[PDB]
Amino acid sequence: LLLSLGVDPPSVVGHESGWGCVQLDGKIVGWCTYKLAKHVADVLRLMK
Amino acid sequence: SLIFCSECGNLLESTTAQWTTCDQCQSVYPSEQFANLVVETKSSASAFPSALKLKHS
Amino acid sequence: SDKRASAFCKEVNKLVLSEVVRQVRVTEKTYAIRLDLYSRDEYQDEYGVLQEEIESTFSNRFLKILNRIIKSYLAKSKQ
Amino acid sequence: NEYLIPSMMILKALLETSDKEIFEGIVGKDLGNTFLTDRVELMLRAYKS
Amino acid sequence: PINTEKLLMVSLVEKACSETVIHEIPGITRCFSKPDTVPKVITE
Ligand SMILES: [Zn+2]
């Protein structure tokens, strides 16, 4: 669902300045801007 | 501002000594292309405990 | 007077050269260090050490301390 | 018992990596941020030792 | 010399400027003024 929702984990460094990390119980699953991180958090909470 | 090799990843030795060659790939490059590397190192803010900073904060 | 009170207070007080320096930038290459020092007015409100005093003690003792700590780290790295 | 191995050692030992990858992974951003850039340089060379 | 490794000049210069003193009377610091209409100076 994260990969569907706008984040992507790379093989070579798919990372830049503003992009913050998203962490699945100790496993890096993607990178996304904090606005999109907040949107993902809220939509995940409401789906749950 | 760093000088990496292009065949291997081995960080080249400082060209200040002599020519640029990686110890594993043994690859050749002209050292003069990237000579005079300027690095402007700055001190992080909120690092000097002052007696006047309270007059500036 | 209170003016002489605060003058004597800053007089017998001890200050550290860190307490008058602003951000310190250091450019790399030679090897160059440049300290920013506050404006002598705001620098003389909370103080009253003169510019020449800074000049002299900066040069002598600051070079002494800087070279000493560089030699410390270089000797630590020699191993 | 405590045990202490340098982090660059296991970083290179974990995957078949080249040093540019370690650098551009730790600090690949804002190309040439002063503090991070010089610290990672010093680390890479201190392991190259 | 170039053979010398890189130096953390920011931290070293901060340590120098933080360790060097202009005028210190040995073992005194922080002279302060506290208020009986009896002006006094309390020094550490
Ligand atoms: Zn190479």
From Swiss-Prot, chain B:
A zinc finger (C4-type) spans 5-25. Zn(2+) 1 binds at C5, C8, C22, C25. The keyword Zinc-finger applies. It comes from the Eukaryota. Transmembrane segments: none annotated. GO terms for biological process: termination of RNA polymerase I transcription; transcription elongation by RNA polymerase I. GO terms for molecular function: DNA-directed RNA polymerase activity; nucleic acid binding; zinc ion binding. It is found in: Nucleus, Nucleolus. Keywords: DNA-directed RNA polymerase, Metal-binding, Nucleus, Transcription, Zinc, Zinc-finger. Belongs to the archaeal RpoM/eukaryotic RPA12/RPB9/RPC11 RNA polymerase family. Component of the RNA polymerase I (Pol I) complex consisting of at least 13 subunits. DNA-dependent RNA polymerase catalyzes the transcription of DNA into RNA using the four ribonucleoside triphosphates as substrates. Component of RNA polymerase I which synthesizes ribosomal RNA precursors. Required for growth at higher temperatures. The N-terminal zinc-finger domain but not the C-terminal one is required for rpa12 function. This is DNA-directed RNA polymerase I subunit RPA12. The gene is rpa12.
From Swiss-Prot, chain C:
DNA-dependent RNA polymerase catalyzes the transcription of DNA into RNA using the four ribonucleoside triphosphates as substrates. Largest and catalytic core component of RNA polymerase I which synthesizes ribosomal RNA precursors. Forms the polymerase active center together with the second largest subunit. A single stranded DNA template strand of the promoter is positioned within the central active site cleft of Pol I. Component of the RNA polymerase I (Pol I) complex consisting of at least 13 subunits. Belongs to the RNA polymerase beta' chain family. This is DNA-directed RNA polymerase I subunit rpa1. It is found in: Nucleus, Nucleolus. The chain holds residues 1256 to 1345 of 1689 of the full protein. Signal peptide: none annotated.
UniProtKB/Swiss-Prot annotation, chain D:
Signal peptide: none annotated. It comes from the Eukaryota. It is found in: Nucleus, Nucleolus. Belongs to the RNA polymerase beta chain family. Component of the RNA polymerase I (Pol I) complex consisting of 14 subunits. DNA-dependent RNA polymerase catalyzes the transcription of DNA into RNA using the four ribonucleoside triphosphates as substrates. Second largest core component of RNA polymerase I which synthesizes ribosomal RNA precursors. Proposed to contribute to the polymerase catalytic activity and forms the polymerase active center together with the largest subunit. Pol I is composed of mobile elements and RPA2 is part of the core element with the central large cleft and probably a clamp element that moves to open and close the cleft. This is Probable DNA-directed RNA polymerase I subunit RPA2. It comes from Schizosaccharomyces pombe (strain 972 / ATCC 24843) (Fission yeast). The chain holds residues 246 to 294 of 1174 of the full protein.
